[PDB]
Each structure stands twice: as C-alpha cells, then as structure tokens.
C-alpha cells in the first residue's frame, strides 16, 4: 500500500504556483503517500469570497494539527483590486498567519553544485531566522493630512499612570506617521529558536539590530538575547566551539557579504524579509530557498513557498502556451512539512520519502535537467537555447520518473 | 604661497579615524591649501563636556558656510558610557546633523581597477540616494513595562480629526513600542534629488519601499515620487532613454545583486544605511566609499567618512585612509565650485587621482591587500603601515602638483 502520512493542513495558492501545487500532489505526493488533508483555499478569490476569513481559519487549523504547507499567494495591490474586482485590498495572508502562529521563519538556500553563486565566497550555507512577529509587519500607519501633533501614549492596565511621548509636531504641511510594537515573550521565543538552531547545526549565531539608534526598542532584543545566552546556552555554545555575538545591521550585511557562510543570522521581522532575498539571490537563484516557520511550542510548523506566483507564466498557461516554471521551492515546502509530520508521528517511512524527494530534486538538476530559469543561471539568458531546458511538465515528468526509480530501489533492500 | 581654500567647517572625530584625520591635514591638505578652517571637536569627550551642544553648533555652521567635512565619530551606548564615564548616552552626531540640515546623502564606491569585486556583474557603478530625514533615525521608542494599551493619536491644529489608533494592547507581560514619522516636504525634496541625480548621470532610477505592507506610510513615498515624475521629469527621462520605477525593498536588493550596476537607488533612511554597506562591500572594501549629504538649497554640502572610527583596534597599524581623504576632496571640490576657485578645484581632483593611482600601482594598506589575496595569505611585504601609506600618498601628491605647475 501507500505510506500513512497523517494530518496535514494544506493552503492552496494563486496563478502559476497553484498549477505547480496540483502537479506536485498528483505526481510526486499522492502516488506514494496517503494524507488526511485539511485543505484551505487561500486563493485570492476565495479570500475575497470569505472576507479573508479563510486565511484566519487555516492558521487555527495549523495550531490544531501542528503541520501546514502553503502555496504562494497574491498580496493584492491597486491593480489586483481592479483585476479581480475585490471588495477590499486584503492584507498579506503570510502576515496574518505569522501574526497568529508566531515563532521564527528559518530560511536557507537550496544548493545545487552546478548553479553558480553570485557571492563566490559562500562555500557554506547561511541560515536566516526571521522573527515572524511585530515591527513593520503588524503596525499602525496613517497619512498625516496637515499641521498637527502626533503623539504615542502608554496606559498601564492598572490605570495608575499614563505616559505621553511626542512623535512629531507638524508645523507646515503634512506627511506620515506610524506606531509599531513587539512583545517580550515573542522576543524570548525568538531567542530560544535562534540558539537551538545554532546548536543543532554547529555554527555561530549573530543577531543584527540597530540599538545604537533604537536604544530602547532594539536594546530589548540585544538584552533578551544576551540574558538568555548567558543563563541557558553559554556553556553549550562553548562546548561545540561556537559563539554568539550581537552586530549592528549595517555591519552584519557587509560581514556576511565577505564571509564564507556557515552561520546562523537572527533577523528582526523586516530585516529577515529583506536579507533573506539578499542571501537567496547571492547563492544563485532567488527562488531556490526553503522557508519554514517554527512556532514557539516546538511542535507546530508552517512550510511555505516564499517567492511570487509567477504571473507571466500563468498568462501563458491559460493561452495554452508552453511555460518553464521552477517547482523546487513549492516541492520543498511539501517535503519540509512532511518531514516534521514524520518526526511528530515517528513515521520512518514518511521521513524517508520526504528526504528522498529532496534528493531526487537536487540530483535531477545536477544531472543537467532543469527549467529555463536555472539554465539561464548557468549559460546566461541570451545564450539559452530551447534544448538547454525542459518545460513545466517535462521537468515534473523527469522528477516523477527519477523519484519512482529512487523509491523503487529502496524497496529491493529487505 | 598656497592655494586660497576659503571657509570650510571641520568636524573632528574619534579614536583611529581621528589620528588619520590629522595626518591628512598635516601631510596632504595644509602644505598646499590655506584654509579659513572652522573647527568643531566632535570627539566623544568634548561632546560630553559641552552636553552635545558642539554638534548642534557645527551643524549650524554648515548652514552658514555651505561646506563641511566630518570625521567619523562614536555613537555611544551602554559599553561606551561606562568607558568614557559619560553623562548621558548621547544621540548620534550624524543623526543630529542630518536632522538639522536635511537633504539626500549620496553614497558611491571608490573604484580601483585592481580591487576585486565580490559581485562580478557590477561593471557599472551603483549610486544610493539616502533620505537623511525621519523614520527610525528620528523616532520615539520606549520599553513597555507591563500590560496596558499603546495608542498613537493625531490632533490637528486646525481641523476636525482628533484620531486615535490602537497600536497594541499588551495583555500578558511587557515589550517595546515606537512611533516614527516623515514629512511631505522632505519626501518631495528627496524625490527631486533622486530625479536630478539620475539625469546628471544618465542612469535609470529606482525607489525601494514596502508599500504592500506599509500601505499608508510607504505609499506616500511612492505616490509623491510618481507624481513629481509624471509632472516634471518623465519627458527628460525618455529623452536620455532612461526610466524611473518603484520596487519593493526585498525585490530591489535581489535585483541589484543580480544586475550590472549603472543606476540610482533611492533609499529610505533605514534602507540607505543598511544597503550602502551592502553596495560598498560588494564592490570590494567597506571603507572605499564616498558619502556626501546634499542639502535641498542646492549649495550646502556635508562630506563625511561613511564608515566608523576603526572598530577593530605604541605599535604599527596600517589603516585605510581613503574614505577620510575623499571627505576632504569632495568638500574642497564643492568649496571651489561655490567660489569659482580653479586652483582649489584642481587640487581636490589631483588628490583623488593620486589616491587611486597609488593603490593601482601596488601600494596599499593591509585591508586592501587582504582583499586581493585573502587575509591568511598576506605578509608584511604586501602592504604599508599607516604612516608609510600616508607618506606614499604625499610623496605622489607633491609629484603630481609639481608636474602640473610646469605645464
Ligand atoms: N511570499 C509570497 O507569497 C509572495 C508573493 N508575491 C506575489 O506574487 C505575485 C507576482 O509577483 P512578482 O513580483 O511579479 O514575481 P513573479 O513570481 O511573477 O516573478 C517574476 C518573473 O520571475 C521569473 N520567475 C519567478 N518565479 C519563477 C519560477 N518559479 N520559475 C521560473 N521563472 C520564475 C519569471 O520570469 P520570465 O517571465 O522571464 O520567465 C517571472 O515572470 C504578486 O501578486 C505578489 O503579491 C510576491 C512575492 C512574495
Ligand atoms: N560617523 C559615521 O558616519 C559612522 C560612525 N560609526 C561609529 O563607529 C563605531 C564602529 O562602527 P561600526 O559600524 O561597528 O563599524 P565600521 O563602520 O567602523 O566598520 C566595520 C568593519 O568594516 C571594515 N572597514 C570599515 N572601514 C574600513 C576602512 N576604512 N578600511 C578597511 N576596512 C574598513 C572593517 O572590517 P574587518 O574587521 O574585516 O577589517 C571593520 O571592522 C561606532 O562608535 C559607530 O557609532 C559607524 C558607522 C558610521
Ligand atoms: C508578512 C510580510 C512579509 C511577507 C512578504 C510577502 C507577502 O506580501 O505576504 C514577503 O516578501 C516574504 O514572504 O518574505
Ligand atoms: C542616525 C544615523 C545613523 C548612521 C550610522 C552611524 C551612527 O550615527 O551611529 C551609520 O552607520 C551610517 O549610516 O553612516
Ligand atoms: Ca520577501
Ligand atoms: Ca552604516
């Protein structure tokens, strides 16, 4: 029979990533794994039909079943509202999910030996732990229409006092203003997730803030990270001959730029978004990256495809024209999610399947079979001929062909 | 007879970059240029002694004389306060001077033909325009001691809209919160500075925000840039076959990493700080970069060393002085442009050529030697110490100026 997968929360996406999402299930997953799939359509039209409530419901389902796999989704702008006749410009589904689940988003490049790096020195991988809560991505911003006073206040729950901070006094014209926050318990979980990842990988840990300018806001990050390290992880880091050190964000980017990789980089929410694409593009391809949210409870995770929905290929697919879409990021979202499922269920067979699918993906590309984007990384786009790459279905066919071989060879071992 | 330099405002710095600052004046500037130098000791000890008033006075002198050159300074924190026994944890001198002067900080790599780039495709130079006003670098942040409400409010001086927004309701434990702002007029001057720089260099311009998430805050940047572009600059951009487009910040870093350079990168205040080190390190060395604040009045300029006061610190040292030198040359070059001073303009350009020619001839400091061969495979024979490299530059500056005098 097939492998007893377990309960997995699925989040369907938009445009070309939704087409690839179904190809992965039909060709690579379902033929070998039986899943209790709790499907939530996070497509832009079902989010619009439910007033974005399906997004919140999918997050609660991940809390209940501990495993979620997410397809890439559209964050609508002004043009998207016109295109789909949306009722509202719905907020980012990833922001809503991360705000509900909390935790740390760990991102790392998907390395193939034949994909050229842009940073030649990065001979070892760089893992970024993105704090998935607060800051710019859960803030209150507004337009200041004219002269006036913008203030930010804090009132303790006991109501015994009240502190009013002056943000700015607009004396001529208007502008913008915003307020953002972060939570002590969220920063402490963010620290523990960062220290444990450095111990499981054997690499040093670096936290990047700007506490020289944000003395109180970022100073909380530096103090919490430093307090937890000295009390619970100091001797453990010294045992594995590693370390933890705080860095200014501007110095950290340049430090990582000229390093040789091999370290954990704990980033605040906004820096994690910016610099993970900096790392992904530096290793070769922006789309060759994993993105797994690790919740503070230590049992719930959300694996996702972090790139876009590839609109240009979706337009070609609807006109029946040939496309060449890279599915690796969407594939590794399934494997990373199924791997954690097998860890929680002690499923030896599901764990072997997830790792085997990741091997087949890497081995197929390293054998010379790849989509057009990966061929352009090697030969350069103006030098890419049609015989240099495979289309969307040819590449999925090659993966399923090689996955079927590797899984069959493993059966002949009893 | 030396060159009549004119009135220049000087800002002295901290630690090693202060030592280099005096060596540049002693060995490169003073022997050839006579200056009405307005000196302001922005050292951490004198800032503490004057309760940071010397920083505000220096910023105001820049308004009056239109040209200032700044040495790298210490921004104190907890470890620095205990070190110098400071009264307060003084704010950044650059944050104060920029908040007073306003304008755009343009940063660009100092290119030497024999320095290897970490990003191979970058064959054309990238120029970052940093909005020097507002955002996290002029914000109000604080620690939330416990449960309670954090609200942000806008009270109009003449209007009917006393609006209150809930920032967050802390229900368990405490945390942190902050409020920040920006100004329409400052964003507009930031827009014009970006469009005009792209037309003077003949390159396309890109603006990076995160307006998909910060719809109102960052949407204002994108709307103001697009409105000024369509009304006052789109025809000129099409004439030179260049363009302006808005990008998301995370998409923009990956696009720039994958590009071949040759564009202007309009950056918000925080991104301008982070990404300018990303660009400088990608072109080779973090300390080979110019940083000039251009004020919106089109005549006031502040040149600085973009890096720090030598983080990594009677022995010999070998420390790169190029960025500090170009702070002087860019300042004197603008001092000469304002004064129509041809001799001063020639001296400023000659010193920059001497600096690049010396490095391209094999004479360089230890960091640049480690750039070409790697630090572990670097010996004393591969570099010059601090005093020898400065003497080598002065030896070549005396030669270049003597050659031009006999022509
Ligand atoms: N985290 C998330 O869920 C994110 C979602 N998005 C959403 O994605 C949508 C489109 O974003 P956009 O900026 O246009 O980026 P796209 O994903 O559309 O990518 C732009 C171009 O890159 C190439 N490309 C990207 N991904 C692949 C792939 N897997 N295989 C092959 N080629 C690829 C294609 O180039 P070519 O045409 O030359 O073949 C494509 O036209 C938006 O609605 C946005 O909100 C965006 C970013 C993150
Ligand atoms: N005045 C200003 O504008 C600035 C002031 N500062 C202040 O400086 C201090 C430290 O700053 P910080 O951001 O930590 O670090 P720095 O900006 O001083 O530089 C960090 C690293 O970059 C490399 N580097 C920088 N400048 C040079 C150079 N000229 N030649 C060769 N290599 C160079 C060195 O790398 P490696 O270790 O590999 O040799 C150095 O360790 C603080 O007090 C801070 O407030 C910081 C930034 C700007
Ligand atoms: C929640 C804000 C950050 C998420 C954003 C995609 C999105 O618009 O949801 C992004 O660039 C990323 O996935 O890193
Ligand atoms: C508020 C401006 C902060 C600038 C900072 C240096 C500092 O003052 O600490 C920095 O590294 C730079 O951008 O040059
Ligand atoms: Ca991103
Ligand atoms: Ca900096």
Numbering used by the authors:
A (entry chain A): 3 to 416
B (entry chain B): 3 to 315, 322 to 415
How is this structure described in the published paper?
pmcIsocitrate dehydrogenases (IDHs) catalyze the NADP+- or NAD+-dependent oxidative decarboxylation of D-isocitrate to 2-oxoglutarate (2OG, α-ketoglutarate) and CO2, and NADPH or NADH. Variants of isocitrate dehydrogenase (IDH) 1 and 2 (IDH1/2) alter metabolism in cancer cells by catalyzing the NADPH-dependent reduction of 2-oxoglutarate (2OG) to (2R)-hydroxyglutarate. The most common mutations in metabolic enzymes in cancer are somatic mutations in the IDH1/2 genes which are found in >80% of low-grade glioma and ∼20 to ∼30% of acute myeloid leukemia (AML) patients. These active site variants still catalyze the conversion of isocitrate to 2OG, albeit at a reduced rate, but have a substantially enhanced ability to reduce 2OG to the oncometabolite (R)-2-hydroxyglutarate (2HG), a reaction only catalyzed very poorly by WT IDH1/2. Interestingly, all the potent IDH1/2 variant inhibitors active in vivo bind allosterically at the IDH dimer interface; their selectivity for IDH variant inhibition arises (at least in part) due to disruption of Mg(II) binding which has a larger effect on binding of 2OG than the isocitrate:Mg(II) complex WT substrate.
Crystallization trials were initiated to investigate the binding modes of the 2OG derivatives. Structures with R132H IDH1, R172K IDH2, or R140Q IDH2 were not obtained, however, 3-butyl-2OG was crystallized in complex with R132C/S280F IDH1 in the presence of catalytically inactive Ca(II), substituting for Mg(II), and NADPH under reported conditions. R132C/S280F IDH1 has been observed in AML patients treated with the R132C IDH1 inhibitors enasidenib or ivosidenib and manifests resistance because it restores IDH1 variant–catalyzed 2HG production. The kinetic parameters of R132C/S280F IDH1 for 2OG are in the range of those obtained for 3-methyl-2OG and 3-butyl-2OG, obtained under the same conditions. The R132C/S280F IDH1:Ca(II):4 complex structure reveals that 4 binds at the 2OG-binding site, consistent with the kinetic studies. The n-butyl group of 4 projects away from the NADPH molecule; thus, 4 likely does not compete with NADPH binding, consistent with the observation that 4 is an efficient substrate for R132C/S280F IDH1. Note, it was not possible to define the absolute configuration at C3 in 4 complexed with R132C/S280F IDH1, due to the resolution of the structure (2.35 Å; note, we refined and deposited the structure with 50% occupancy of each (3R)-butyl-2OG [(3R)-4] and (3S)-butyl-2OG [(3S)-4]; Polder omit maps of the data refined with solely one enantiomer are shown in Fig. S7). Furthermore, NMR and mass spectrometry studies confirmed IDH1/2 variant-catalyzed production of alcohols in the cases of the 3-methyl–, 3-butyl–, and 3-benzyl–substituted 2OG derivatives; a crystal structure of 3-butyl-2OG with an IDH1 variant (R132C/S280F IDH1) reveals active site binding.
